[PDB]
Design a protein around this ligand. Sequence first.
Ligand SMILES: CCCCCCCCCCCCCCCCCC(=O)OC[C@H](CO[C@@H]1O[C@H](CO[C@H]2O[C@H](CO)[C@H](O)[C@H](O)[C@H]2O)[C@H](O)[C@H](O)[C@H]1O)OC(=O)CCCCCCCCCCCCCCCCC
Ligand code: CLA
Ligand code: CLA
Ligand code: CLA
Ligand SMILES: CCCCCCCCCCCCCCCCCC(=O)OC[C@H](CO[C@@H]1O[C@H](CO)[C@H](O)[C@H](O)[C@H]1O)OC(=O)CCCCCCCCCCCCCCCCC
Ligand SMILES: CCCCCCCCCCCCCCCC(=O)OC[C@H](COP(=O)(O)OC[C@@H](O)CO)OC(=O)CCCCCCCCCCCCCCC
Ligand SMILES: CC1=C(/C=C/C(C)=C/C=C/C(C)=C/C=C/C=C(C)/C=C/C=C(C)/C=C/C2=C(C)CCCC2(C)C)C(C)(C)CCC1
Ligand SMILES: CC1=C(/C=C/C(C)=C/C=C/C(C)=C/C=C/C=C(C)/C=C/C=C(C)/C=C/C2=C(C)CCCC2(C)C)C(C)(C)CCC1
Ligand SMILES: CC1=C(/C=C/C(C)=C/C=C/C(C)=C/C=C/C=C(C)/C=C/C=C(C)/C=C/C2=C(C)CCCC2(C)C)C(C)(C)CCC1
Ligand SMILES: CC/C=C\C/C=C\C/C=C\CCCCCCCC(=O)O
Ligand code: OEX
Ligand SMILES: [Cl-]
Ligand SMILES: [Fe+2]
Lengths: 449, 107, 34, 60, 342, 80, 336
Amino acid sequence: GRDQESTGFAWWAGNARLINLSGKLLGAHVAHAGLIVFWAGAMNLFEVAHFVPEKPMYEQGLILLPHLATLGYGVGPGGEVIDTYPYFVSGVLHLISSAVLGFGGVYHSLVGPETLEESFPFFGYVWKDKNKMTTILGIHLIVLGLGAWLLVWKAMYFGGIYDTWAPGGGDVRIITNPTVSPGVIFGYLFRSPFGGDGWIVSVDNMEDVIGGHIWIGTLCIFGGIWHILTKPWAWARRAFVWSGEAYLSYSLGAISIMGFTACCMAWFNTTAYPSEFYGPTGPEASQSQTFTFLVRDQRLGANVASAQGPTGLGKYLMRSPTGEIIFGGETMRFWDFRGPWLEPLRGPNGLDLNKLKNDIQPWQERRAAEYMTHAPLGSLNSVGGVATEINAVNYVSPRSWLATSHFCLGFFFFVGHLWHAGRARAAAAGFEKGIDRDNEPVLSMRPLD
Amino acid sequence: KIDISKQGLNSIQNETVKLNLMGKSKTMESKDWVDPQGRKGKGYGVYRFANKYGANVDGYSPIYTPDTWSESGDSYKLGTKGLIAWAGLIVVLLGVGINLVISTSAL
Amino acid sequence: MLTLKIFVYTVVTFFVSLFIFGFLSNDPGRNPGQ
Amino acid sequence: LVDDRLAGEGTGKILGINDPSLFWAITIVFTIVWGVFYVSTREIDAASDRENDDDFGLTL
Amino acid sequence: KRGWFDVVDDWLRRDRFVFVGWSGLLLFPTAYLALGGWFTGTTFVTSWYTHGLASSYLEGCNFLTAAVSTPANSMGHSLLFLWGPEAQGDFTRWCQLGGLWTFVALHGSFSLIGFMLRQFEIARSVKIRPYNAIAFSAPISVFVSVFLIYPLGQSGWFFAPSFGVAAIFRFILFFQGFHNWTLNPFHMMGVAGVLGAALLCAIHGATVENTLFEDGDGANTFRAFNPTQAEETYSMVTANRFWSQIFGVAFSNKRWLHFFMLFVPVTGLWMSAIGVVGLALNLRAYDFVSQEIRAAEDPEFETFYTKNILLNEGIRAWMAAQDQPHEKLVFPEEVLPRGNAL
Amino acid sequence: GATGERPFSDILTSIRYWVIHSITIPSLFIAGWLFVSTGLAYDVFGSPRPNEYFTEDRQETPLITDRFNALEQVKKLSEV
Amino acid sequence: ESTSLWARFCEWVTSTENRLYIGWFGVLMIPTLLTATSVFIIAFIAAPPVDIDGIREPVSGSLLYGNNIITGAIIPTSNAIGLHFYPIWEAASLDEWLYNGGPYQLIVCHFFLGVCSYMGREWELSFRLGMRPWIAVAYSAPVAAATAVFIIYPLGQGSFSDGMPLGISGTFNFMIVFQAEHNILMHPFHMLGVAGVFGGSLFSAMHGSLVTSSLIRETTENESANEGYKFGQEEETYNIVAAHGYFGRLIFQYASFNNSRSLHFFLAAWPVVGIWFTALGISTMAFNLNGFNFNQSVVDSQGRVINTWADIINRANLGMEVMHERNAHNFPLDLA
Ligand SMILES: CCCCCCCCCCCCCCCCCC(=O)OC[C@H](CO[C@@H]1O[C@H](CO[C@H]2O[C@H](CO)[C@H](O)[C@H](O)[C@H]2O)[C@H](O)[C@H](O)[C@H]1O)OC(=O)CCCCCCCCCCCCCCCCC
Ligand code: CLA
Ligand code: CLA
Ligand code: CLA
Ligand SMILES: CCCCCCCCCCCCCCCCCC(=O)OC[C@H](CO[C@@H]1O[C@H](CO)[C@H](O)[C@H](O)[C@H]1O)OC(=O)CCCCCCCCCCCCCCCCC
Ligand SMILES: CCCCCCCCCCCCCCCC(=O)OC[C@H](COP(=O)(O)OC[C@@H](O)CO)OC(=O)CCCCCCCCCCCCCCC
Ligand SMILES: CC1=C(/C=C/C(C)=C/C=C/C(C)=C/C=C/C=C(C)/C=C/C=C(C)/C=C/C2=C(C)CCCC2(C)C)C(C)(C)CCC1
Ligand SMILES: CC1=C(/C=C/C(C)=C/C=C/C(C)=C/C=C/C=C(C)/C=C/C=C(C)/C=C/C2=C(C)CCCC2(C)C)C(C)(C)CCC1
Ligand SMILES: CC1=C(/C=C/C(C)=C/C=C/C(C)=C/C=C/C=C(C)/C=C/C=C(C)/C=C/C2=C(C)CCCC2(C)C)C(C)(C)CCC1
Ligand SMILES: CC/C=C\C/C=C\C/C=C\CCCCCCCC(=O)O
Ligand code: OEX
Ligand SMILES: [Cl-]
Ligand SMILES: [Fe+2]
């Protein structure tokens, strides 16, 4: 290693001593990737070993297994786990590959070449060499595009992916006609983030997901090819700071945005995050509660359409601010919800009174009751229910865990982007270690008013 | 004003750690020194006014001075017989304690 | 109401374009460092 | 109906454009500012006493 | 030094790892006894016979729910000595009756007195000014008004805070429900003082750390300082210009800056103490009579103040039965205020 | 500098120190364990065991009503 | 000499000779903040009642409608609207716009953009003056707290009506309802935030008193020491060694800070981390991850429940829960 004597960086900032050491930096990155794969495999093995078939996935605190279920692995019609062997296979493969990755990282960090700019010119680089950095960026863009295309191939030729909107209940479908319309793809991208619109979180069928992935794979491959063959222009050289910490800050900001988007998608989406494996969402539980109370009160001989509440608005059915027929109560704020068990009862102008008066199905009622009781509310020590409940239920929704953790991560990485962007801009200018007593900039300016 | 030799940091084996504790670094006073990110040095060193005030804050109030350590304590006077007696006593006490914990509990 | 929307859109795009094209105009070079 | 309204909230339009006039306003203002910047970006660069070669920019 | 006083002063005011001083004789025993009493009460002593709860680790409570509980309301304002006419020398029954709370409080007050005296003595020995000793008056006033004056103006020690986390939370919620403590201007000044003190601390730390001087060649700037140096380590001119162009106003006097830093939280805490002293006699700024009259005459007038009033009413009605066992309040379920479907 | 006591770094890295304190700390730990397990903690400080919260006489929470007869009242309430 | 119109405009915008720095972030900051300020003042003075719960029960919050400073507020947007975008041009008339709670959304959006631009402008002036750019990082804690109470909580609860009102009594109502629904007092992140503010006050008073106690004599007794300090002077005005000696004899030697830079970094770091954690706690509780629930935890041998201070807190929460909205609920569970 090194020391503060010959570096100027303390032990709590020791990873900054390998900014200009290409081999050791590569070793550190490979070791970290091995750590990530190790966690994936170990967590998959931990979750597969603690899974019982008498309870749904969201009732047992699983977050990695529902990811494999949505890919159509070991699941059946209706969203019931049938086989649990592919999860074991995936976990074993990840855990074993982590060993190779960790060995590579340890080798490159301990006994590998310290600075690979003289023995391996192809892999060597300088942070200020724009062409080499752009070439590396293009290579990794090509790799990511290949990964997106690999995801696309699964839904088409290798058995497909789980579709929660499939006719006759959710099942593993095959996507034959993806939506590759420019108007459809641009509609999701340049949509408002507010209610009703929802930006890209509002994607409501797997055809749109597969079409967007085709688009993103093609774009990434083309951009990688473009960057391999070119170098930044004058307007780009005039606008950016060119150093390793600057590149790190850019990446930190990008992945902070990604983390916030992931949190929102986990909280709100139902297509890519089926409720069969993640439980009901926020609005879904409220809509289910109103639906089941309407059904129960209708079974007791009541007129749900003409029933009037304490405020005079409607106990079960009211009108949305645009005219659509929606559920009444405080769930009037969640009328944008759209779920597979509720859509069949919805007509062109909202809920159909005759359909919910004569054509409500027992499976719909069971889904509504289950999503009502398993609402995404809980406590830090995993106690289900509102904050004024008793210790009877040990449950916290998998959506809550992912949403909270990823919001925290996104905020902290935004703060990291701020820190590193500021430090890079200051260090490149040349005053990151303090002000110069001999030449203080403020002393040379005219005093203010 | 401050004598570095009288600060009690002369009994440290590791030269780099010794230099770290006095707030000194021979590498950094060179005009051609470059830190990991790639910034040249102005020859100040760790502290600009090291000659004016004697030493740094590290060389002013150290918290690890092996010179002031007691001459005894680096060797056990009781020797091997004391260690053997200690081993016997700790084995006996551990047995007695585990027996008492098991007996006083509900098995 | 459409006139208000057009006016607000014009104002917002004016200010955002000013921001973008000002930060694109060799901003890192405006520092007192030597 | 009793009155009239734009009726566009919660629809999912690209950039919220329901009328081409908004697109025209955005494009015209952006183009004006871009042209003003484009005329002067040559003079602005020359204030650094350096040429915009491959080594230009703030580097470390 | 030949006299008894002289030799005792020579030994007491010695240069040592732990300074004892003349005030140590009052500080160390009382502080040790208060800490030990709190730890013993939270670990072993219960609260079943005085409050009807469990407040110890022995009974199955964690760090948050363990506390030293106040005596029963029947005891009034009794000082509850170990030898008093209630415990009568019985240690176990003294612990069961709630005498450990008064023990801890009475020893803690004298420990606070001894600590301010120690601050004064150490300041005088080093020949500096006693502004640190002056600053402790705000915590001492807060402790005196909350733990002594407020219970002394109530039914008894039963309504004092209990030395615990969840007990303090219950005390806070009780103060909200019954006194409308959030609507007290003195509490508003206290909140402003505390938040402004935090603001000042953060902003001063950041401003000093980001206007440093280049006194070294290393990126670790903590090693470019020496306490005996003459020149200041940061640029006051640069800091002043930055904050003048960003905020509009800025400090130009270090002494005034640091006195303001001292002045803000002390004043906030003193104002809150005055408010609690006033609240000890149920002199609460609870309601606005004009708003109540307008809402009574007009069934359409509603503001957030009325909603807060309803919330306080619900808190009182639903907490009264268990929080005050001595009143023996039995409330039928149909008299408790309640909303629709909730 | 130093106020005239042995440095903590010197003491904590001593064979004598770790020979003396390989007995005292475990002895205190075992003493506390035996204090709790032998029932002394309940008897000294008067805390109720899990089976002594409610007696056959009263099935409600205790309440002390008299200030000067408090000793006798708490003696009666604690009766098993 | 600048000649182009754009070059002159850039030189003026990025000028360090202005009385108040403009910058490129100030270009975004000034109009948004002015818009929010104007709408806030006009609504606080003369706005009509706003239907906040969507149950046709308007709530007054304006001075002209029978309120004082303590009682006045800006009522959040209607519950019927939800998270939908409600700009001024989406209303049939200004009378309808003011009835549903438009000004709250307008002010909230403009204020969020303005505070983000304010932090950016802090960085910008730090760069232009030749400083180190982390005063902006310090400001991120209050920025995150404001975002959490104004944006993230409505985002997770599905409506802007669950947002914090722009008033005093409205703030107290927000706090009480938050406690009744999430048990915020039992949240470790709220405990960390409380520790942060209490420690910030402690350390601010401690530092101010220690610096004021070591002032070197440069005046007489008929004038203040502030007159003893001269702006722009080079020598230090107080005895760091004397203050360190006093503190190290007050507690013990190795507890005080001998390094002024380290002491000021600690002063900066404590409250910032505390507020970061409390804002993270609010944002986490937005997605219904409440605090510790030690209700009916202590149970005796026969199975009966022994109460605790946590149970008393639960009784208070039940009291303030069944009354936070009297007529807005038709079903037993508050799932939102
Ligand atoms: C180009 C630059 C930006 C330009 C535009 C800027 C506008 C700024 C306006 C000012 C106000 C600030 C922004 C407010 C955002 C509010 C987001 C919201 O109400 O909701 C967020 C939306 C969620 O949309 C939801 O999407 C849902 C999707 O619908 C459908 O979703 C599924 C589809 O299958 C299901 O079928 C489901 O039933 C169905 O309803 C619904 O439509 C909901 O009504 C809808 O609200 O997420 C999303 O847009 C995805 C994630 C968005 C970004 C991250 C948001 C969280 C972080 C905030 C910022 C950082 C804070 C921390 C740092 C602080 C310090 C700096
Ligand atoms: C260091 C100082 C100190 C101080 C100030 C206190 C203060 C207090 N203690 Mg604590 N205490 C201490 C140390 C101290 N304690 C020690 C070392 C122990 C041993 C563990 C205790 C154990 C203890 C117990 C067990 C109790 C207290 C309690 C109290 C209160 C006692 C009330 C009383 O009537 O006092 C006595 C009154 C006085 C005024 C004494 C002063 C009289 C002067 C000196 C005249 C001397 C004249 C006399 C006629 C002649 C004697 C001389 C001759 C015998 C040689 C008071 C708040 C009580 C409590 O808190 O109740 C809730 C209680 O129960 N204390
Ligand atoms: C995420 C993980 C991580 C990784 C991969 C690295 C990586 C690296 N660190 Mg950093 N570091 C980290 C976290 C990490 N660090 C943290 C948390 C801190 C704060 C304490 C630091 C502080 C720090 C300092 C102060 C320094 C480094 C340095 C180094 C580099 C040189 C290694 C070396 O010389 O000493 C390795 C020393 C040893 C011989 C220990 C070997 C133990 C091995 C590696 C354990 C892993 C083995 C595993 C159990 C089995 C794998 C085998 C396989 C077959 C399965 C290395 C690339 C050095 C540097 O700057 O280089 C120029 C250095 O000066 N780091
Ligand atoms: C991994 C991510 C990635 C990254 C980090 C970069 C990074 C960079 N790109 Mg590359 N690029 C990528 C992927 C990426 N690119 C892809 C996928 C493509 C194919 C479209 C390109 C095509 C491309 C071109 C054509 C150019 C660059 C340039 C640059 C540089 C300028 C920075 C900049 O964006 O200005 C900051 C960003 C802006 C001012 C605004 C951009 C935001 C756009 C306009 C949003 C709307 C999207 C757009 C209309 C595309 C359609 C959407 C889609 C659905 C079809 C920088 C080195 C420039 C250059 O230097 O080339 C050598 C340049 O001229 N890139
Ligand atoms: C993408 C290029 C970015 C270039 C650099 C930008 C730098 C920053 C500039 C300032 C940005 C903030 C102010 C913006 C104000 C104008 C926008 C506005 O108010 O729109 C508000 C309008 C609302 O539009 C509404 O639409 C309704 C129907 O849907 C009705 O028609 C309403 O009348 C209408 O107002 O929304 C939009 O214009 C949609 C914007 C979509 C943006 C997609 C960006 C995709 C690429 C980036 C992806 C990541 C984005 C960040 C995500 C994480 C965030 C934490
Ligand atoms: C575009 C700009 C964006 C941000 C704008 C910010 C505007 C606010 C500025 C307020 C300055 C007022 C200072 C007065 C006093 C004054 O003149 O200050 C000036 C004072 C000068 O200090 P000196 O070192 O020169 O003093 C020397 C000594 O000898 C004094 O005796 O500096 C300070 O104390 C800074 C602390 C200001 C703290 C102000 C906080 C806010 C106050 C509360 C606001 C209530 C609003 C109610 C609305 C209904
Ligand atoms: C350099 C460095 C570092 C780092 C490091 C790292 C990060 C590493 C990693 C590493 C890694 C990352 C590793 C890994 C490994 C792995 C392995 C070794 C595995 C194994 C496995 C197995 C053996 C399995 C088995 C099985 C099967 C087959 C089936 C089922 C069952 C079981 C599970 C049993 C540190 C920080 C120290 C610092 C200094 C420097
Ligand atoms: C897959 C998928 C999809 C698709 C997607 C896509 C296709 C996307 C794209 C995306 C994109 C395409 C994005 C972009 C972005 C961008 C950005 C975010 C930018 C930024 C920028 C910046 C930040 C800048 C800055 C600046 C300025 C302004 C000034 C000067 C300086 C600088 C340059 C720095 C969908 C949804 C359909 C469905 C689902 C799935
Ligand atoms: C009552 C009384 C008394 C007194 C007593 C005493 C003085 C005692 C003491 C006692 C004591 C003196 C105790 C203590 C205890 C302690 C403890 C129980 C501790 C614990 C700790 C912990 C649990 C820790 C934790 C942690 C960790 C591990 C990590 C980091 C953070 C912390 C540090 C928090 C007398 C007889 C005089 C008289 C009568 C009455
Ligand atoms: C000289 C010809 C060369 C290039 C011109 C090419 C294409 C012009 C195409 C479209 C211009 C109008 C764009 C309108 C966008 C949509 C507006 C709306 O949604 O109302
Ligand atoms: O609005 Mn305001 O507070 Ca959210 O929870 Mn449901 O809704 Mn209403 O109640 Mn609770
Ligand atoms: Cl409802
Ligand atoms: Fe200071």
